[PDB]
Write an enzyme that holds these catalytic residues in place. Structure first.
Site, PDB file in Angstrom:
ATOM      1  N   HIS A 157       0.702  -1.265   0.126  1.00  0.00           N
ATOM      2  CA  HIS A 157       0.099  -0.006   0.038  1.00  0.00           C
ATOM      3  C   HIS A 157       0.894   1.316   0.033  1.00  0.00           C
ATOM      4  O   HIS A 157       0.554   2.293  -0.775  1.00  0.00           O
ATOM      5  CB  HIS A 157      -0.702   0.087   1.082  1.00  0.00           C
ATOM      6  CG  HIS A 157      -1.962  -0.795   1.180  1.00  0.00           C
ATOM      7  ND1 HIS A 157      -1.822  -2.100   0.951  1.00  0.00           N
ATOM      8  CD2 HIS A 157      -3.411  -0.883   1.349  1.00  0.00           C
ATOM      9  CE1 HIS A 157      -3.047  -2.835   1.093  1.00  0.00           C
ATOM     10  NE2 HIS A 157      -3.785  -2.017   1.253  1.00  0.00           N
TER      11      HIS A 157
ATOM     12  N   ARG B  73      -0.803   2.352   7.614  1.00  0.00           N
ATOM     13  CA  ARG B  73      -0.438   1.008   7.752  1.00  0.00           C
ATOM     14  C   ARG B  73       0.306   0.877   8.904  1.00  0.00           C
ATOM     15  O   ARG B  73       0.054  -0.270   9.360  1.00  0.00           O
ATOM     16  CB  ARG B  73       0.471   0.460   6.592  1.00  0.00           C
ATOM     17  CG  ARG B  73      -0.159   0.623   5.054  1.00  0.00           C
ATOM     18  CD  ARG B  73      -1.409   0.022   4.933  1.00  0.00           C
ATOM     19  NE  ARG B  73      -1.235  -1.415   4.506  1.00  0.00           N
ATOM     20  CZ  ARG B  73      -2.161  -2.085   4.883  1.00  0.00           C
ATOM     21  NH1 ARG B  73      -3.470  -2.075   5.264  1.00  0.00           N
ATOM     22  NH2 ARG B  73      -1.679  -3.669   4.355  1.00  0.00           N
TER      23      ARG B  73
ATOM     24  N   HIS C 151       2.029  -3.250   8.796  1.00  0.00           N
ATOM     25  CA  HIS C 151       3.428  -2.866   8.838  1.00  0.00           C
ATOM     26  C   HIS C 151       4.152  -2.139   9.824  1.00  0.00           C
ATOM     27  O   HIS C 151       3.558  -1.485  10.633  1.00  0.00           O
ATOM     28  CB  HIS C 151       3.233  -2.252   7.483  1.00  0.00           C
ATOM     29  CG  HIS C 151       3.005  -3.259   6.255  1.00  0.00           C
ATOM     30  ND1 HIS C 151       3.758  -4.225   5.923  1.00  0.00           N
ATOM     31  CD2 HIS C 151       2.108  -2.776   5.157  1.00  0.00           C
ATOM     32  CE1 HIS C 151       3.310  -4.504   4.499  1.00  0.00           C
ATOM     33  NE2 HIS C 151       2.162  -3.897   4.346  1.00  0.00           N
TER      34      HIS C 151
ATOM     35  N   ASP D  24       8.848  -0.829   7.102  1.00  0.00           N
ATOM     36  CA  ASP D  24       8.188  -1.331   6.033  1.00  0.00           C
ATOM     37  C   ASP D  24       7.592  -0.114   5.114  1.00  0.00           C
ATOM     38  O   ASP D  24       7.916  -0.225   3.757  1.00  0.00           O
ATOM     39  CB  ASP D  24       7.136  -2.388   6.317  1.00  0.00           C
ATOM     40  CG  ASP D  24       7.419  -3.693   7.152  1.00  0.00           C
ATOM     41  OD1 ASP D  24       8.631  -4.079   6.705  1.00  0.00           O
ATOM     42  OD2 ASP D  24       6.718  -4.077   7.819  1.00  0.00           O
TER      43      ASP D  24
HETATM   44  O1  MOO Z   1      -0.209  -4.457   1.555  1.00  0.00           O
HETATM   45 MO1  MOO Z   1       1.094  -4.233   2.707  1.00  0.00          MO
HETATM   46  O2  MOO Z   1       0.619  -2.418   2.414  1.00  0.00           O
HETATM   47  O3  MOO Z   1       2.304  -5.175   2.016  1.00  0.00           O
HETATM   48  O4  MOO Z   1      -0.112  -4.938   3.796  1.00  0.00           O
END
Ligand code: MOO
Ligand code: MOO
Ligand code: MOO
Ligand code: MOO
Ligand code: MOO
Ligand code: MOO
EC number: 3.1.3.2
Lengths: 222, 222, 222, 222, 222, 222
Positions: free
Chosen positions: A144, A177, A183, A187
């Site tokens: 995301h 996130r 995350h 991340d």
């Molecule tokens: O899609 Mo994350 O932003 O890798 O949970």
């Protein structure tokens, strides 16, 4: 994994044009490192934010999977980005999504398989829609965040006069996130290196350079 | 400060068309947070590296202003970017040193005037040359950094078959600051954000467009 | 809120004659600073203590409002402060529970509405009784704390030969919060400041003066 | 050590009426503890503050040794506190100084002999007047902080209507020691527990309760 | 205490010859230290591996109690240590266990009575067999790590063709307690000191002398 | 590599029988970890004791090289280990030194090549005799701590009336390197594992066998 040759409505690139995050991104913070300790600190900060408005906005931010991204960026962009109000822009974004969320982040994600806070601490994210699905997804880098940053980067080129507000949403998108629980802060941070990288490959891909042209002019009379 | 109106040989954008570094970026890590603690161990790590090849490279990645950034990449572009070989490339790359270096950072550099590490510790840098001119320049976010990345997203859209080496070097041009004692890790990380946000803005600039075009045509050559 | 005008059985001072807790005290340790990290290890330490004598005492140092603070000290005052034995003492001590507990803290308690630890961790306190009424009460700074100290500087000027035991218990009445999971270490420390600043203000109050006087006369007795 | 029986113009109490800090104060943060790590963090924060106005005010804050304390509190108090403008108050403060700076802090200071930042790091304080003299003085708790807090506490009783401003100076006085390099933040913090304790003993000492009476009325017509 | 005068089939040394671990060993880190912060990080990293090849091994390693130790070294020793293959051997390993596990840890253990990670976090171990029995047996130092090390050193003095191996296993054999969650990394590192120490007092016992020879002999034709 | 085939008076085992420390040992903490943050705190606590009874001992402990080790154990052994008092003994201790110090640390040492604290901080050690020679000899693990431990274990298997003593000294004998600043606490803890390991390979050598007996014998009438 997929790519334009199999999901041409979610990618503009082939796995071969993909950015090698594994090689471009530094390993993620290890457990027993000071950086991780900060990740943990950032989570708790994030988690206590969840029952705040920024929190609600974080839950309803986990949703970008389909057209949602252009939804998250509506206000910041100024004009609404809908299939009906601006379908040229709305397609541009919808098409580049998995290039940002999957291609840009695949080698590292899969190579490291970093775990995730919700799984680390054993407590549920703020928006459990994709939880069980992502629960088995490399935590590092974040999809995301890569999407949020790349879209925003792309949107800033369409409406430069509103880039600060746009870019901020882009950024704010990645942060949601952290608040949510999907995350670790690292991340989210690394995601933006990769997410800015794909928007570069995309500027070399003909299919993109034409939808960008259609999105530009379509807004330039709207 | 300056911009394309006072020195259009290093800017494309005007103070008006610049990113709100101060508004987009979060505040730097404060002294007394686990974050700064990490910035510190990082500096230590970079320090001990100074006397190795990396340190060697770190040494050299300090000179750019003259358009040494162009020469920093020539190696990973597989072709040499020079004034005698890739005139369009070389010019393009230099007319924007300051769009990415100053305009992209200036806003938050001034507002935080954060302490660089050679100064926080008394010890001098790996390259003392600009150590002076910079000692009285905010540390957050890094300008060399936001130029290594900016100049990379541009050389990667110009030479996609080699984007991974390009992007890596640009990432490395920024790590060097950290190893040279010139910037804290956090200054470098936060710099890739503004670094990437400026290219979006640059792509909306006729002067940049043009040269970017000529750069591409001419590339088919050298 | 209240004061000596609405409930003069627990206040001497008026909202007007109160300390600017919010203006005097520094901000609490934020999540992500080495400070909070310490608050945390402290909580852990207090937790493991809960099942020992101290924990036992920690258990009891939670009940005060009724004037249990008076009974908390009776032991270290070498004489029992009660309503049947030291009427002047006992009254004095109770008419100011709230000058020290609420007025002394209220200003910053509300402005930070900091998260208590039983709530930050989910786990409940060593004494759940007031755990409810308090869950929606700022953690910074501690009111029981700023009452254990205030009520100590007063019993120590009344019984100087035993000031060290008095002062120690008052210090301990505050540590208990930390061991009970009710307050973070930093809430307790910062509470001794306002706790001590209120007594200064109390000494300027005729109503407090009077009773403090009667308390002293009567003391020569019991 | 001295006391009223040998320096009756700097003490109102005998060594026998002294508060036992050793017994009342928690051990100081050890090296290898998280709390110390914060002390170190607080120093660096402090040290970088030194070339700021708050810094200058910190250097010219190390001076309270004689009448200086009543000087440091002039503005906050409102009216000037000089031997010539308010000698009753000016004596009250001058006399209680070592009760606060030495008696209240002696058992712990001497028992622990904690080291000091300037000596720890080998760099000079911001005001090297008493450096070499204090260089051999237990760092924990701090004398000036005890003095600053006790004076301010005492001043708040004379001019309640200006206690917030007074109390803040009192507090700010202790902090200046952190900026300067003489005390770790923990020294400054513990100092305030003890400094509030002596002002209690002082309220039982006749010599003090009379100079307080003279200082009160002397200002109550000034 | 127990020993060879009360349990001669697991003991060789009497209590009179036990080694003073309490004395020869530093105290275990404490909630508040930086090293307990790392004890925790290693607890977390341990958890993450519980469900991997290594975690299974860890789980099995929790069983030495009776021949579990012999059967835990067979792969590393090079041959199988069974009551009917390497009998002399198996016998030795079988009666020293308690020397290395009980005798060489009792003082430290009993005195300090340190909280086990599992009890600390309230999270079942990875092989709950012993968890109850050990839930109230001091954590510092690890008795399983002692045996692991003790026995690994005696076997190395038997089959020197593969000491790296026999030793690497003994080492890991103690790490397992960290992954399983019965001990902190610190009780494990400590445990190895007393673990190696007892092998000295053991070379002092005629019985151990006798056996070990026998075992060494049998290794000839086997 | 060096050994008994090239220096038979300090060696017993050949290189072919050296123990693989690189392999049997975990890597040394790294700038960035929480455990190196504690390596530093122990370096600081070490410094503070350099000028105390303990620091002098530490300084002297830096001298084992030639009989320094024997003369470092005499107080603990109970009698004096001199080439003319406890000759058999003194001889043993004298020719194993390198086994425990060189052979049992070479791989880890050479491979990792860890920065010594003194070189790290740029601060002379506490007994500069060896500082130069060792300034470019890998820090992880400590060879002096090995000898300390190795020899302490062999002596314990000689004079078991005072193992606690002979052992406590060996232990400290390694801590001295931390106070002196030649090693990090971590190279010291590690060093003890390889330190105890070699005493196993040593019980495997006939020569060591011969000598040690002799030494044990001589301890009869001595
Ligand atoms: O899609 Mo994350 O932003 O890798 O949970
Ligand atoms: O130019 Mo920096 O701002 O020294 O990389
Ligand atoms: O009353 Mo607190 O504010 O729970 O000590
Ligand atoms: O006098 Mo301190 O003890 O340097 O404030
Ligand atoms: O036996 Mo431990 O004491 O659980 O290794
Ligand atoms: O000899 Mo070390 O390797 O300086 O203890």
């Amino acid at each position: 994994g997929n790519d334009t040759t199999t999901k041409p409505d979610l990618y503009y690139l082939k796995n071969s044009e993909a950015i090698n995050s594994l090689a471009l991104l530094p390993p993620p913070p290890a457990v027993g490192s000071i950086a991780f300790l900060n990740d943990q600190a950032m989570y708790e900060q994030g988690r206590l934010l969840r029952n705040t408005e920024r929190g609600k906005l974080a839950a309803e931010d986990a949703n970008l999977s389909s057209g949602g991204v252009a939804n998250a960026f509506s206000g910041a962009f100024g004009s609404p980005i809908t299939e009906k109000d601006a379908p040229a822009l709305h397609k541009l974004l919808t098409n580049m999504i998995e290039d940002a969320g999957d291609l840009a982040t695949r080698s590292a994600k899969d190579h490291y398989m970093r775990i995730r806070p919700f799984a680390f601490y054993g407590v549920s994210t703020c928006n459990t829609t994709e939880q069980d699905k992502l629960s088995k997804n490399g935590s590092y880098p974040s999809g995301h965040t890569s999407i949020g940053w790349a879209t925003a980067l792309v949107l800033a080129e369409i409406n430069p006069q509103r880039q600060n507000e746009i870019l901020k949403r882009g950024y704010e998108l990645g942060q949601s996130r952290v608040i949510c629980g999907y995350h670790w802060q690292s991340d989210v941070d690394a995601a933006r290196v990769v997410g800015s990288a794909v928007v570069a490959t995309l500027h070399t891909n003909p299919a993109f350079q034409q939808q960008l042209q259609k999105a530009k002019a379509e807004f330039a009379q709207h």
